Assembly symmetry: C5
């Protein structure tokens, strides 16, 4: 078994696609192992770059193909190189840009907390012919400032496990364990834009919709309620334009339905408070004491729905 020593430099993480559950990672990858000694020009290490490699693999050089398990498609490999030392140690340094995929959960959308996973594994050699020895992850480049959409919380967490594939039991018994290296990078979303432009004006609209029970007549209450319902529909549209598509509801999509519920409960209370008549002429004030309590009632419903 050859002991391969990986090191992954993560330059940047971006492009989080919420519907495909993918995200783009750009960085380097440096594998290193020890083979047979060789004679190079002089004593200095020989460096082979890009297209030169395929001239060395045809001459019998052993270079494994380390694939990313959770990549989507194929990484756009830029430069790559092989450094060979007279001692017999080879270093394969390549540069990748990949559209990786994970199982993400956006169910608390502006106050999100995701983790980004990179999985790596030999494509053909099991852990009796190629095993990983360690892994270092360097994420110095990725910053924590207000400008970035994701705050990276702490260093990466690496892991070296042994996956088992039962489907190779028919063609290769007793040797089907593959050595896999995992990398997890935690991240928290930047909730500033979604707190100032989506939560606060929706709160103001819901809080100002309650002040239609101060109007005196009944037709004014109804016409004002219909104007407010058109306002809430236009606001649901404005949030539906500048937002990421999802197959499940976010926090803001609970708040929009809370706005619809407040508007419809106001319309129901208006019709009920008008409709308390003996034959059609008797006015009413009793249920219209809900100018200070039905706000507190639906605010209690919302604060319970938070908890």
């Amino acid at each position: 078994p050859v002991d391969v020593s990986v090191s992954i430099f993560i330059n940047k993480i971006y492009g989080v696609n919420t519907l495909e559950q993918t995200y783009k990672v750009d960085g380097y990858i440096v594998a290193q192992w020890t083979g047979k000694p060789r004679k190079t020009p002089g004593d200095k290490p020989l460096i082979v770059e890009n297209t030169q490699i395929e001239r060395w693999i045809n001459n019998g050089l052993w270079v494994p193909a380390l694939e990313f398990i959770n990549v989507v498609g194929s990484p756009d490999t830029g430069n790559k190189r092989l450094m060979l030392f007279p001692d017999g140690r080879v270093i394969y340094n390549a540069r990748f840009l990949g559209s990786f995929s994970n199982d993400m959960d956006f169910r608390l959308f502006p106050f999100d907390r995701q983790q980004f996973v990179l999985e790596l594994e030999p494509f053909s050699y099991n852990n009796q012919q190629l095993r990983f020895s360690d892994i270092q992850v360097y994420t110095e480049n990725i910053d924590n400032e207000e400008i970035d959409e994701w705050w990276i919380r702490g260093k990466a967490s690496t892991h070296i496990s042994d996956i088992r594939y039962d489907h190779l039991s028919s063609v290769q018994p007793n040797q089907n364990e593959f050595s896999r290296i995992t990398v997890r990078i935690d991240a928290v979303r930047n909730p500033s834009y979604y707190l100032w432009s989506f939560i606060l004006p929706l709160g103001l609209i819901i809080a100002a919709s309650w002040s239609v029970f101060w109007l005196e007549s009944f037709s004014e209450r109804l016409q004002t309620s219909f104007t407010l319902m058109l306002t809430v529909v236009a606001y649901a549209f404005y949030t539906s334009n500048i937002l990421p598509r999802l197959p499940y509801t976010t926090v803001i999509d609970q708040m929009i339905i809370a706005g619809y519920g407040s508007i419809f409960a106001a319309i129901l209370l208006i019709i009920f408070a008008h409709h308390r008549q003996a034959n059609g002429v008797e006015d009413d004030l009793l249920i219209q004491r809900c100018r200070l309590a039905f706000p507190l009632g639906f605010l209690a419903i919302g604060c319970v729905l938070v908890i």
Copy 2:
């Protein structure tokens, strides 16, 4: 005839395009057959990876080209490899990402039920020179949780048939049957987002539009009806933004037209109930008993249109 034994690992299914009727599949494919015995280095199986293959096919190795019948374009083949055993059995394992196409029917859109089909066939060898022996489909990776947009219902259904092409009757008589392997994966859409954000507020808007016959005068009824018609137009827009394009109407696009019909029937009833005058001064109440029945009338029309 060579007996080829296929196995397809479906990693993920996503990206359903409703207008082109395509969907992206990502996974592996492992074909396996038995050829001539050979002498490899030692007794262990020889592994050829990526670019090495085209150096073996030039030396006369027989590797068939299995194409996907319903793919669109060409799959983005990532890694691939050939494992050759001294016995004489060869294993071709490749990784694909393809934009497959099927005949989908989105006519009940949020409560949809689709099936995803992968068809596979030799590109050149008919079933007298290459026939498939079996196929196993492994879909362990694809989960059924709330987060995924599609729930996969049960395992895949495989099939090995013999397609006949009559157009090769002129150049190759008596041998035109091609062995094809089919794979069907059933799936149901996740209707939660389309039930909470599109059906419920539209139901509330249609139900609150009926309470314009509680207003006393006639001009207030008309102005309120025009405000409600603008509300329904803004709602049709809001659903037209966050939705998949189709050449036929969905369920939600029947509900929008039901909202238009309710608004226009309310306007017609308002004009008719006002217009019952002898010369222009006689008021009316008789047809305005439809504050409790015309709701039930259009609800009966809608519940019949469901059935």
Copy 3:
């Protein structure tokens, strides 16, 4: 002159881009000619697939390059193969996905009628060195059902003509005619979605906008007319979102301008019918007999604009 016999299998036609006037075609293409006799392994025909070909053209095999005249870019050629028979007849079967271009006329948009053209021609050999003999087009796969956006009406129409290029008169006199094969596939758009969701509610909005002359006062008429004008602007937006961009107006964009004209003629008639006063106190009813005639007037204008 070599007699080449083409056959084109059209698998699917989709992706009609209205602004670039392109459309994507996916299918096969099978050319066939007769060369020199040869000795193959045994008597059976030898099959060369994919990358093998470029090893045969270097050894002097004559394979012409048939290009698509109206393609945009280069087709994404998938698999391809050459079948050589001891007799001396060669068959070149390839698979293409191309973004073809034509001169389309969307001036009657929902009730459209287009035709899809595929043009094919040798890239270098004129009709004294390579002429086409026939062409069969097989479009069995393309269905006529409600689900498809385009109904294909009848089989394809093929044509073999001889194009003349005068610009080769300076370098190649007397031989500049190139043999071209044309293919036309007629298609009609599916107008169901554009009849139920765009024509009917716009008709209802225009028909309900006429009932503002039933209101009694003058300020109510004006305020209601301005609400209706905002409704028509929101509807023009809703159609502008879910529609294909064009540099000329469709039928629906005549109907939107008809709605604007109806709203503005209603506002003009309202101002004129109020403004018939001797000094400012005299009411009017005479021009307000247009609650039953100005509908018929603008409906006559619309029905004339249809014819």
Copy 4:
């Protein structure tokens, strides 16, 4: 110096991107020069197609690389070929699709007038080793009809100049002039869609906004003015959706600001005409003679802004 004779066939021009200032051109390019005599099979000219060429350049054939100066990226070169005549004259015919770039000025947007430029130059050989002799441009295919978005006005204008690069003064004195061929194709935009759907309804909205001074009271004037301001905002949105992004204002974006100015001047005049009171009870009519003059005033401002 070798005399190269270029000829460019422009098949189609489309895809004008207003923000990147690019546009896509699709067509052919035929260069032609005279080298050494050679012996071909027979006397007939030998034709080399596609991949064959790189087998001839390795054998010492001299084929220059003519690059497009203003292209963005690299053209998607389709087929290409070399025709060699026993005399010694070579013809290189290739097919390109490129995303070219120019300096465009959309400051009069619907009534635009652009020109499309193709610049061509040898990549390495200066005008002492390779000079262009002439150029013919054939644009027969591009039509002038209503369907096309751009009307091509007259034939192309070609030019052969000698660019000087001073930065090669350090490595190559006395020889730094490069022979460049320029091609200009004038084009005018089709203003029909932007005249019927954007100028006319905006004119109608501005002209109907002036008739709020016919209302009697003061609160009705203000509420109607606010409804009209919402109408103008919705119209600015409708034009902002179906339009090309720009970093400077168009003609239509002057008309939208003119609509905003008309609405705000109406609100200012309403507040001023109401606010002429001695203590709060005195009515006014004097400044309300602007129902016929303030239309003419802002129309004079607009007609001056045209000139």
Copy 5:
């Protein structure tokens, strides 16, 4: 150590992506060094173009691979060439189009001020085997006119530093410093479109929203305030459509929240000024002196928020 002399010609800078913080650069790059003397055909310099190079590197020519440190993916390298002089000096001239990345700060969005950075470094050779000698940047092509979205302010600023990598301390002690060349190009956004179409009508809407305290009754004030709140929501949508996505708020997104605050403070003042009653019949005028001061109050708040 080989002294490499770089020169970068920036043709165009465009395509600024605000969410990925990338931008596209298109231009040339000319490296130049001095190797061993050689014998070329004649005395004139030999020119190798495109695919010829990989035939020279296999024959042992030393051409380094200079990579862009901050590129995303791999540049779309077009043409490239090597000019070799009998003296022994080699010139490598290539053409790139790259999607570069930087740390951009859009926190003052229409009045922005960015800088575009290009970083360049040898991929494998440290500064004991390859060091850069100088760099000239030529940006003559990029203009400062109104048409361009970015005004380039002054020439580029270049820099040659020595980066240290500690992770190579295990495999290469005492030699880990890499010579890097940096290029900065300052740019200012064109704020004309965002000053005429977004700041001025929003200012007019906020300034006209203050004139609801001129209305006499109380229900008219509330209904007008709700119409104005719907106007501000529609305006926030119109700015959210034609704008670049960001994870932090811009200046215009402070102005939208200022509009929401003005509307809600008007509603609060209306409810408070009505609600000053002894039991429900007492009118009020005292707090309604804020028709001239609450404008100045919120304008003072805004002008303080500017400073």
